[PDB]
């Protein structure tokens, strides 16, 4: 017998003391180790509601991840606005720092449990007959990127679409990824070319078969009609018309006009994606802009495997005959709840 | 490049408060930073202050850090410079500098400390 | 403070000779280091920036090398037009508190 209630709860992490990284130093300094003999009890004859988008676990996991990039990230300058409008700012030293994020469990204490849902074709939110009780969640990377999910779980057998309203096109869709799409992010070394310009390199092959996949299941959720174009973000800041992400400290925005052309009324390159390296962001914690560093020497690698996405609906097919979506993000809320889905804490009676 | 024009020659008494000004012309205004540097007569070079224009954030030089102010107008492309309480070790030659930071208006930014152009310079006197 | 000193105060050199122009840094400013030309009644030049890179339109015959706290303006045989007085100027640290050199008056030697 349990009780839907939320609580004060803990992280665990296997964060190095001697790694001058900084998600390790503050996984070190305000987590503890993760569970030395961690355990999973299903339970017999438990149907569980569960609701992800209404989760206080992905508002602990932001604030948690918004205290992570204010004590790490040191950008030379930081302005915070209020809207008469007038803003601040603040100086200091901005040193190049390493950043790779890290797996970070989430334990609840005392009295409170853990449940997971084991549904392989669980949606979102609804009812679940195998449930699941734990302590703490699987180790979960704070991956802060944009329109793209890298480093995260997938989906066990379909493509998972998952929404807090499909019928409302003012709220965003998650599509959740059975299978990874590889991306090799590079900013080469030797005067040659701009300090900024960097590209991300993709199989065409793979993403075109997910891309498939994802419209297939578009399908199958509603529709069957004509998926049109796919085009990319409708105005707004560079941080949502373009994938936002950092790599190794730096601010990389890529150009994803071309992953973004689905012509699919019914059904050697790879995909070479310019990026810029920004010092000059919006940062994503609504606090207003950072300026940092130029970038290090060398080259800047990173190899991840896109897990999922993000997109938004323009509610075109209700009086026409095509469906419109475009990438979205911002809000990381989105980010943490595509890893936090299965989970809820309850309070033990 | 950019050509920096700088205001006329000033005369003012202690305790007065100067106000001098340069035009950029010439490249994108957001792209540069600017930085004021002064010179008295017969002495060398002092750094006073740099303002990163796309930012509107101005740093200034300890010794002064309080009385004076560096601003940006970006719709006439002007930069300014304010010193208040003059003082007469305050007569100098001001000259209005800048550099190219990169496609700022993209988020690039080089945050160069040099000078690659320079005013023609402003003699300002404080004196009883 | 980083205080950066130059050395010597005067340097008479004989026309078409090389002249080797001397800046101390009080601490570490790595390569943030640049050098720059004045003639008297005109503003200065910017000559050389990280501490060996030379400006568009500066002759070859201006060389900076150094790195740390110590650098080295060279002219490897000096031109009517490069008699004028040289600084160089700090800009490593953050926040900017940027320092000019008292400058090397560079004479003709006669």
């Known amino acids: 017998v349990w009780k839907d209630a939320e609580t004060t709860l803990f992280c665990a992490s296997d964060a190095k003391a001697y790694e001058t990284e900084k998600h390790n130093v503050w996984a070190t300094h305000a987590c503890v180790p993760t569970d030395p003999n961690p355990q999973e009890i299903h339970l017999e004859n438990v149907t569980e509601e569960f609701n992800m988008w209404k989760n206080n676990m992905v508002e602990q996991m932001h604030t948690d991840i918004i205290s992570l990039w204010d004590q790490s990230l040191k950008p030379c300058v930081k302005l915070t606005p209020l809207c008469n409008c007038n803003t601040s700012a603040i100086t200091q030293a901005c040193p190049k720092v390493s950043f790779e994020p890290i797996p970070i469990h989430y334990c609840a204490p005392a009295g409170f449990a853990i449940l997971k849902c084991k549904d392989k074709k669980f949606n979102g939110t609804g009812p679940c007959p195998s449930v699941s009780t734990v302590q703490c969640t699987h180790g979960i990377k704070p991956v802060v990127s944009t329109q793209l999910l890298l480093n995260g779980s997938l989906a066990e057998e379909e493509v998972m679409i998952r929404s807090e309203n499909i019928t409302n096109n003012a709220k965003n869709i998650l599509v959740q990824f059975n299978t990874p799409v590889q991306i090799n992010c590079t900013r080469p070394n030797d005067i040659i070319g701009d300090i900024r310009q960097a590209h991300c390199n993709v199989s065409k092959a793979t993403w075109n078969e997910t891309l498939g996949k994802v419209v297939k299941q578009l399908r199958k959720h509603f529709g069957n009609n004509t998926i049109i174009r796919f085009a990319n973000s409708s105005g707004g800041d560079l941080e949502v018309t373009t994938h936002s992400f950092n790599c190794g400290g730096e601010f990389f925005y890529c150009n994803t006009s071309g992953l973004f052309n689905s012509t699919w009324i019914s059904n050697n390159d790879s995909i070479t994606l310019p990026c810029r390296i920004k010092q000059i962001i919006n940062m994503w914690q609504r606090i207003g802009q950072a300026m940092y560093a130029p970038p290090i020497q060398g080259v800047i690698r990173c190899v991840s495997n896109i897990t999922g996405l993000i997109l938004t609906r323009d509610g075109g097919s209700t009086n026409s005959t095509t469906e419109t979506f475009r990438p979205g993000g911002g809000d990381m809320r989105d980010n943490w709840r595509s890893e936090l889905y299965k989970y809820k804490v309850v309070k033990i009676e | 490049e950019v050509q920096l024009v700088e205001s006329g020659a000033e005369v003012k008494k202690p305790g007065s408060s100067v106000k001098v000004s340069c035009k950029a012309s010439g490249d994108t205004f957001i792209r540069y930073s600017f930085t004021w540097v002064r010179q008295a007569p017969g002495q060398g070079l002092e750094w006073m202050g740099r303002?990163?224009?796309?930012?509107?954030?101005?740093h200034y030089a300890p010794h002064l850090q309080g009385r004076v102010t560096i601003t940006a107008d970006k719709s006439t492309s002007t930069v300014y410079l304010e010193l208040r309480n003059l003082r007469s070790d305050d007569t100098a030659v001001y000259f209005c500098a800048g550099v190219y930071e990169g496609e700022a208006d993209e988020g690039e930014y080089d945050n160069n400390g040099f000078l690659k152009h320079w005013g023609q310079g402003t003699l300002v006197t404080v004196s009883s | 403070d980083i205080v950066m000193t130059q050395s010597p105060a005067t340097l008479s050199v004989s026309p078409g000779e090389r002249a080797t122009l001397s800046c101390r840094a009080s601490?570490?400013?790595?390569?943030?280091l640049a050098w720059y030309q004045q003639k008297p009644g005109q503003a200065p030049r910017l000559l050389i920036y990280?501490?060996?890179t030379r400006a568009t339109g500066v002759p070859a015959r201006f060389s900076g090398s150094g790195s740390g706290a110590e650098f080295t303006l060279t002219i490897s045989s000096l031109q009517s037009e490069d008699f004028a007085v040289y600084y160089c100027?700090?800009?490593?640290?953050?926040?900017?508190?940027?320092?000019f050199g008292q400058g090397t008056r560079l004479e003709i030697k006669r």
């Open positions: 100027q700090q800009y490593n640290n953050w926040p900017p508190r940027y320092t």
């Open positions: 303002i990163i224009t796309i930012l509107d954030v101005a």
């Open positions: 990280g501490a060996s």
């Open positions: 601490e570490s400013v790595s390569s943030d």
